[PDB]
């Protein structure tokens, strides 16, 4: 049971990394398409010294 | 003595600690791939004898 | 690795360092309970500089607290970030302070220095490469002056190879909070000349003219005023806590910043500063940061730079920025204010930058200044000392406490013999 | 075979080498993991090979302080570098020659020398040491001077080239930087076979004007230095017409044995959307190096005589074009030579175009690295001489140095050696009358 | 927990490559427990010319 | 399998044992009624609880001790409190007449009505005892019961069980503080007759634990419960390596072999580490080196004797929890390097290491929850100062026949007073003989 | 077909044996239930060296788990590779050694050695040509110190033509894990010297040196510390189980490793050892294997061999390789370090090549060395013995069990007659 608990910890960390990678990809793609549609509308995001 | 530093803390023998954690995760994922790891290992009996 | 031990003496030192520990805990990610809750892995990069650990990832600050009055101890303990400190580091004593340098130095103040040095000794032996000690104290008054300078002396005797930072608040010209502030200030700076490696003179009036002329606040209290002190204490020790191009720690600052060993009294500064209404109409950039350093309305020591030539100027930036900007900006400052910068030290400016700026800010910077302008502060303290000394006033409670006549004249002579170089190098 | 070992001392050397290995991994075709993506012999010169296919570098990242090595070994290149030569101290040298050479020099000189020996074991031909440091900070002066003493003792028959950052004559970022520069140059004059001086003022001006980068930073600066490195040590990387090893540099660049300070310049430093509008011909790449604006230290070349200059051509360059360009250059009356060196050019041709890193510079078909040992470097030495004279006239900052291991006479020894070097420069620059 | 490991999906689109430089982890260097179980006699005393395997 | 019998004598011994078996029950998971809620736990599988608690068909975990006292109301407190159902009715032996703080009444006259019943009980507990490792004797050198019934008990147990191990955990008479006037009589006349019959006797004091609770546990107004609950921690660090598993398995027979160099010198000095008070323990490191140095600091000894005024002759360290042997090595090397731990010249190997993988369990009380601990037992020459001072007390009290009549009219002859005095003279002679360095 | 019975006693012996059976079950392909799950027939070809065959394909070790106190052998059964041993070779008793050589050699240990002999003899005819026995034990302490040497003696007189290898944990310089280690290990050595054929001294602080500054571990556990012992004791007996060129057995090793019958005290080393962070960067080749092997850094004994001359040296290499690299590296190290090698014995290194690497590695090497530097061990134990024997301390426990002063005297005399010959061969 001790090494099973260690194994649950490792599986938690593995799904943490893969979920973080997918979430980062999704947030980047969402930001890109939001900027695209705002440029279609006539506005844009403000980036520090853009 | 010293201050007995923990994980993530970059003070001490942390480089070998983080390589050891990479090795532990690395062996755990090898066990994921070859399917002998303990997270299933009943889980074809554990629920297949427990089916209502 | 490298560590700093934070000593705090006196009520003023205790409050200033408690607010300092609040600022450092907010910057690093340690909650009031002590458990690390940050957002980036790089906040825990160099957590050993201010925090020792415990069991379970609980980071206790490496701070030694001392005073003669066990009420400021309860105030710090009952503060918001109060239950984070070591309870054995709360070195109190059931006695009186009575803002008396004799009573804090030669007597009941020195009756506790053995336990204080025991705590400091264990905190220094529980390290590998200690860089030094920073003590927060009040130059005028007792405890922080009285036991403070004695503590500087014993720590300097035990460890002669570490940097002594002393963040001290000097007495103000307009107002005084204690009538024996000139006495305590002279008897404290007499020890501070030949002991500590770098001081930080933080005057209250110059600390607060910031709160008018830039911050435009109406009723700021000391909880607001010590935050600028905490911002500068965080900004000085930032390249040894966070990564960045062209790093600079305390001892590199000291060697680049102290030309002669007695001339180590600095004026501090923190300058991404503007009022709440003027925040949105500001053009936050490295040139305006440099200008807000070098304008004489932002610094925390009541000493005019146009009253004396600058010997050395250190500038430790925080935030992602370009290097040609800051190099050309401090060169342009040197060229524009050519007469107010010395000629015998070409490039009298030490520059440093660091990657991550403080939270809630995009670029910040701390300012360290050694000029001949500190002669005004020391000379005013000397004039007020010779005013109170030629009639032997407020002195019987030094002599009855155990202090003699002749080293009052030694302290005043050391004051004048420290005023002598800081006026000879004004005219080379 | 034709390998060289790089030693990176101080933070300047560490991040310059970070840019260098960033360039080298994509130049030779190695992913930053260290595994070649596969589908020759070139890989040998800076990368050793271990077993499964991984190509570790022949570098030693030595720093007296942490956090600079730590950025590397926790960054995107943590798997390429072997952790044993990533040698860190526990205490910053703090801008002191004494603290870089005497007190904490002996806690790490044994480790760094042991790792130089360990890297030199698995090598047949030691062509030389490439040593990356500054004349600024205490680590980058004191530890490289100690390394010169120890490497001259242990490997005296081999070549050693230093690629040093010269202190900026206008801005600079320290107050004891003239002290450290003059002291380490005194102690490394007799041990450096050839020293290449690159200057932050000049790279700033180049980035502002030719690369039109108005706010450059140190990654761009070290990248532009890394282009110089990869251009100079490329003929023993790839094949070409006239390949030059470091032995031709240690035969051709130095007429008089203590004058070993050539200045090295680049060409196509143009800025990515800018050079569609001229040819970037061989005439361009030869003329731009001799122009007095791409000079990588702030010395005026018209105020000096070029004694010897090596052009290292890289890419699709026909040697007829370099010979035509040399004929064009040698009729200039503003590029003045000495009278005792009728043939003053060393040409080298390499058949591969420079590879581009995603960033500022653009990949072009022609590039050069120009090495001239002008006599105009005496003015650069004289500026720091003037600075040290004013700082030493009243013992400024002397106690931090003296109370940690200096004797007072080393400042006078450095002054005497620099005065002798100035006399040697003007004596080699004076024209023959006998 | 124990009952949710099959529920936790692991084969999503990370964007990072499967194996190579970036990835998230490596798969062959973890555990190559299998030896080189191949003797000198078997390696270089192999059948020189290939022959049909073969009595009564 | 590997089980030892506890014996507790007197008020002091019986409520050593009350807190001791509270801690034993909450270490093995055993409920106050006598059962266990569920097995499949590291504390209560079989091999850990078999050491103390026996079994029964109806899940009853009956103790392996004897709670003997010559007077009631303390045994009655035990069988009236929350542990009434746990202890067996004959397992708690009570008399009907207090020993009256007289060694003569403890040994000679009212001992014979109870020694046969006590030996019958001990014979029974030894009959259901497969591998008997030894007897743990808990008593004081003070009052009459612990002074005299133990003095008879070691004699009878040596007659019938001569080869067995006997580990005393003795309450020694404190340097200054005391609870009686005839403690100088009782301690001397008890030690004289148990010196030849006790195998090893760790002496723990009261004023030293008073100072320990005052200084480290941050409690200015504590009682006997806080006093000897720490002794329960001591015994739970002594006899635990045979209960759980660890790196080094130290045995009960190993303590007497490693701490007793000579037949009469069998008097170690006990101390404990983490003694911190649960609002102070989580702002410190509590590393292996620090908890090792805490035992050898000259203020954490649990008997008021200064190790500087003497030389160590043996030391055993029992490390407990998530302790690593390679920090153990560094800590012991560091404590050997510095001068103020001055060992004698006839044992440069003077350390024993016993490591247990079970973290210490906190009782509901004042000690902190810690994952590391060490109990250090040192046989040293520094106890000779306390013994000579006790002899000074005895000589000042005996020079004019104080309280002699109570002892002599009870059944004891007068010559035993002179015989115990010269026994103590020989004991301090042996202590000063083992002191100086070898010169031959 | 040649066979070794692995009989081991004591806590150290049982834990080292548990790790050894884990290591050899790994190398031979037996999972903890006792079944063969391999990939090549080379594992099963010589499975009858450590593993007896039963019905159902169950391979049971030829192990004799022996202990006086059944606390840690029971944990060996509870260990990972626990359900593989015979229940019938779990010989034990109900007593304690009490770290006493007297109470391992002249009491209930002698009552239990008859049952141990019954087990070992019963295993001995399940053989065709048994090569010998392996005892792993701790000289300092009990159980294996007295009763282990009693087993050694009586097994030596019952079978005199079989090779005995004893892997003995000698006492250590800095810390001793038992205060009667000087008595116990000296009385064990006195029985070792006219008995055993191949002793291997294993020191826990030498293991500390290897695991701290070669392997670079932060928490070195006894699992890894006995795993190195398991690695070297699997590496010495390699060609007995796997094919190759120039195969070597244990008697093959002894005749090539001992000059004289008494001088059989070795000091081992297993050395493809690399830190976990530097494993990918390691460049495993014969010259660096020989450098790591002949460095005085990876030795399992706490004696530097730069203070004494090697008498003989063996290198048991494993792996598919060209072996002139081994030959030229032996000759190169012999020529480079000639002052550390005796001149009256020429060509004093044996090369022993096997064809199968350890499971996980690629090319390995096990060192055996009969060094003069083993004299420091015996001199240190002589000082330790005579210091606590001159004052006759810790000795009534020994005399009460049935021995007297003259046996201590004879043990000391025999162990100084160990001191004389290795010194006179180190000084010719
Ligand atoms: N390209 C590049 N140049 C640098 C960098 N850091 C510093 N420099 C140059 O080096 C000079 C001072 O830094 P260094 O000499 O490297 O300081 P150091 O070698 O780390 O020695 P210490 O200051 O004691 O730590 C500056 O004037 C810069 O011109 C860098 O990160 N990249
Ligand atoms: N923890 C703890 N220690 C005790 C307690 N009672 C006594 N002690 C110690 O034991 C010593 C005396 O107790 P005893 O020897 O048992 O008293 P007694 O044997 O019953 O003697 P009398 O009843 O007076 O005949 C005192 O000096 C205390 O130091 C207790 O109740 N709890
Ligand atoms: N910046 C800052 N200064 C303070 C604070 N509290 C007190 N001071 C200053 O401390 C000076 C007096 O301190 P002092 O009497 O010496 O404190 P003592 O050492 O405990 O006696 C006053 O002049 C105040 O200006 C604070 O919270 N922040
Ligand atoms: N290498 C190794 N040594 C051990 C281990 N366990 C114990 N030892 C050593 O064994 C010695 C003590 O063992 P000992 O008390 O004699 O056990 P016993 O034989 O059962 O009495 C100590 O000095 C330890 O160094 C282990 O697991 N591995």
Author numbering:
A (entry chain 5L): 52 to 101
B (entry chain 4Z): 2 to 53
C (entry chain IP), G (entry chain JO): 1 to 428
D (entry chain II): 1 to 39, 46 to 440
E (entry chain 5B): 116 to 169, 172 to 173
F (entry chain JG): 1 to 440
The authors write:
Ciliary motility is driven by a microtubule-based supramolecular assembly known as the axoneme, which consists of nine doublet microtubules (DMTs) surrounding a central apparatus of two singlet microtubules. DMTs are patterned into repeating 96-nm units by two rows of dynein arms (outer dynein arms (ODAs) and inner dynein arms (IDAs)), up to three T-shaped mechanoregulatory complexes called radial spokes (RSs), the nexin–dynein regulatory complex (N-DRC) that links neighbouring DMTs and a network of coiled coils that regulates the docking and periodicity of the aforementioned complexes. In addition, the DMT lumen is extensively decorated with microtubule inner proteins (MIPs) that bind in varying multiples of the 8-nm tubulin repeat, but with an overall periodicity of 48 nm that is in coherent register with the external 96-nm repeat. Here we use cryoelectron microscopy, cryoelectron tomography and proteomics to resolve the 96-nm modular repeat of axonemal doublet microtubules (DMTs) from both sperm flagella and epithelial cilia of the oviduct, brain ventricles and respiratory tract.
To shed light on the structural diversity of axonemes across different mammalian motile-ciliated cell types, we used single-particle analysis (SPA) cryo-EM to reconstruct the native 96-nm repeat of DMTs from disintegrated axonemes of sperm flagella (Bos taurus) and epithelial cilia isolated from either the oviduct (B. taurus and Homo sapiens) or brain ventricles (Sus scrofa). We find that sperm DMTs are the most specialized, with epithelial cilia having only minor differences across tissues. Our work demonstrates that the DMTs of multiciliated epithelial cells are almost structurally indistinguishable, with differences restricted to the intraluminal tektin bundle and associated proteins RIBC1/2. The overall similarity of epithelial DMTs reflects the similarity of epithelial cilia in general—they are all approximately 5–10 µm long, consist of an axoneme sheathed by a ciliary membrane and have similar waveform dynamics. Nevertheless, the absence of obvious structural specializations in DMTs from epithelial cilia is somewhat unexpected considering their roles in propelling liquids of very different viscosity, and the different sensitivities of tissues to ciliopathic mutations. For example, genetic ablation of the β-tubulin isotype TUBB4B causes severe loss of tracheal and oviductal cilia in mice, but has no apparent effect on the number, length or beat frequency of brain ependymal cilia. Our structural and proteomic data confirm that TUBB4B is the main β-tubulin isotype of pig ependymal DMTs—as it is in all motile cilia examined —suggesting that differential sensitivity to TUBB4B depletion cannot be explained solely by gross differences in DMT structure.
